[PDB]
Design a protein around this ligand. Structure first.
Ligand code: CA
Ligand code: CA
Ligand code: CA
Ligand code: CA
Ligand code: CA
Ligand code: CA
Ligand code: CA
Ligand code: CA
Ligand code: FE
Ligand code: FE
Ligand code: FE
Ligand code: FE
Ligand code: FE
Ligand code: FE
Ligand code: FE
Ligand code: FE
Ligand code: FE
Ligand code: FE
Ligand code: FE
Ligand code: FE
Lengths: 172, 172, 172, 172, 172, 172
């Protein structure tokens, strides 16, 4: 048992390990989406930038949880990073919709993590989730909801003009 | 025989001369396209700039091959620069499509040049083609493929609004 | 078939996809090693930095291959990123030894990739491997060999004083 | 008929097209001379610079006529650019003599162009020729006459010392 | 066997050792030529500078090969550096002619080294030769060919005025 | 006989030539030692720097004697530069010990050179040896004696920790 471990339940430690894996997967999904829009038959270079940056952000969210696990005296256990769901996301509107879906599932996982730490009476792990992840998730979901709404109101996915102009004006 | 000539085959020298002519022709084609979009009944001033700059670049690729020929001890032999294929490229989408076609043919010529220097065992001429021309070609073809894709997805050539907006936002 | 695809063999495309996965795995291995040395019962903060930086570098090597695949007209196919080999690398000397081993295996894969592109007569893909990956690998392997040698000559792994001083003076 | 065309005779338009071709040819001749003096058995690097710069200038004179043609509502028609007259201009004195000859022929063409625009009563095209081409030609011919005179008085072409010193002091 | 050695053939290692010796010899030859022109009965101080700088460059080419040998896991074996061929190179034109000859022989050795690495399937050692030595050699030979041509056309070696003026204007 | 030669004995001239060769050899020995410590199984990068810098210094001592020989009207005669004594100097302590030995032998040669110039009554050559070489030698020998003493008192050659720490703190 770790010399720094205090008030840190075996269940929280396992949950933190499952959340690290989820953030890595989210990083992988965004990396996959990014280079979809870099294809010559898609060619939306700011969608690609937007998702490459989201990819780098999610791996920084994972690294922070790895830091928290060592901080609290638990042991990181890594699992396979599953290959993403799709190889061909049709359109810019479909990608933002998958991203919105993915960000809600991550949020749901974080809310369950917070409920477990409330019940294990771990106030430090609670504040960590609140301070670094919960408001980030709410802001990400609101941003992606906005993007999805603009893309629909513009006429996407059937109008490539709409998707082209959204690339230049919102994401550029 | 030249005092600096070493490991430089008569066939490579002829091939370099044929490649100089191809680059000049490519320069001429782009010059012709540039001033098509400067016509008052076409009036896309950034298409014209894009192609004038490509015109100047191709003549700088030709000058570099002339420098290489003197560097290796061969003798430059110049041929007529053929007048380009078209006087009226219909639309911006049609010009990028001809440019994509032209850039692939130049690439194909460069790949054949590289195969001949491999077989004549001229590693310096191989590295020269690799370092200065091969990745340039791959980047040019990918750029033009992107432009062609955006123009189609926007509704060109039937939508002059699409071509107008591409001029302002991608090429400006 | 892609409008930009030229002289790009189905076998090279598959090989590039297998190399992207290998670089991601290497990135994952280094990320795992990094946070091993961040544990409170290991506590070598510059080993952790050294490997976190190597982790970020390998994912940038992967992103470049994804860019090359789109550049040449192939299609990225992603596989699961396997969880790394170990959860507990004993010592700093053992980690540098695994890293040396991993970097040789990546090199071997790159040399086989280069042999396949030579035989498919793809000089652009050859120069890409030479210019961006081959000398990087040779420099990485020489660096890790040096680290392993210093750690042994100092008295590692049995001397934690040796490992402590190497952390401060070579990696800091 | 062009919406901007006014007082612009079919004969002037054809003459402008023939002058564009002449300027391109002049650009090609100078490019050919430039890389003659870059040969290792000629090796006069400032003759080469002098003629490379004249080459770039003549293509800028051609581009200006293409701009004028679009400005006035005519249609550019491009012809083959004939390969230059010589592959081996013997000496620096012989090249300046060919350049002097070429510049007089261009001047003669410009004077005939000006006579046709006088007779077609096109005062704008007259002023354009006067303001941008006529004094340029007179200055070029006087410069080349000076160079030819100095080279002869120095002892060229039989004295390579003379040609060497002219390269360093007048053209450097 | 070295812990970093990978795909590095015993024959390449021996060839690299023979090339290190050749570069040192070339450094010695240039050092010898340099201080010939520093003699009071020769007294061409810029020939001396030109060759002293070439001397320092060749030893830096040797040091780079020593670095490559350690990089790849081979073992440097040094041989005697033979005293140069001449003690009295007659004239500036004769020295540039020996230097031209020496630089072609070094090039020939490098081309044979590249052929051996092609046949041993060592693409890293191939790119190293291409990237650091092959174009350097081509540029050196072209420079020395130019110098030799100017010196002859000026009237060297019988005209010490020619050699004096070349010292001041080309090499100063 | 040289127009600048004055009070310069045939014996001094020969001795200066033998000293030039000794300095070149010393330069070669240090170059050899430098790249010993650059080996991956030795890996002491500051020993390597220390000896590479000493290598460059000794060749600058040789160049100064070549300058002196021309200054006085003698004729430089170069001999083979013998390959160094060892290919594998065991340890850092053993290299500093060979370097100490080599520097004393060079000093002894310089003292004999000074004795010959005293007896040939060449006060200029005496002051040259005193002003540029004699105090340099005394300072080099004292420095190397210090290094050897520290390395022994630290526990070298049996302690690679000692050699590692000396590399970082004294030579870095
Ligand atoms: Ca799976
Ligand atoms: Ca024709
Ligand atoms: Ca698994
Ligand atoms: Ca290459
Ligand atoms: Ca013709
Ligand atoms: Ca007027
Ligand atoms: Ca000998
Ligand atoms: Ca010997
Ligand atoms: Fe996000
Ligand atoms: Fe996240
Ligand atoms: Fe281009
Ligand atoms: Fe080109
Ligand atoms: Fe690495
Ligand atoms: Fe990598
Ligand atoms: Fe001109
Ligand atoms: Fe002109
Ligand atoms: Fe050189
Ligand atoms: Fe060299
Ligand atoms: Fe010294
Ligand atoms: Fe010395």
């Amino acid at each position: 048992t770790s010399q720094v471990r205090q008030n840190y339940h075996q269940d929280s430690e396992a949950a933190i390990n499952r959340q690290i894996n989820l953030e890595l997967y989210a990083s992988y999904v965004y990396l996959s989406m990014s280079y979809y829009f870099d294809r010559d038959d898609v060619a939306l270079k700011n969608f690609a930038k937007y998702f490459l940056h989201q990819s780098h952000e999610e791996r920084e969210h994972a690294e922070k949880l790895m830091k928290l696990q060592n901080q609290r005296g638990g042991r990181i256990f890594l699992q396979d990073i599953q290959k993403p769901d799709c190889d061909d996301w049709e359109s810019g509107l479909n990608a933002m919709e998958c991203a919105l879906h993915l960000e809600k599932n991550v949020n749901q996982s974080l809310l369950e993590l917070h409920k477990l730490a409330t019940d294990k009476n771990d106030p430090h792990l609670c504040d960590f989730i609140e301070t670094h992840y919960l408001n980030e998730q709410v802001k990400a979901i609101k941003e992606l909801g906005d993007h999805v709404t603009n893309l629909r109101k513009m006429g996407a996915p059937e109008s490539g003009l709409a998707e082209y102009l959204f690339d230049k004006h919102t994401l550029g």
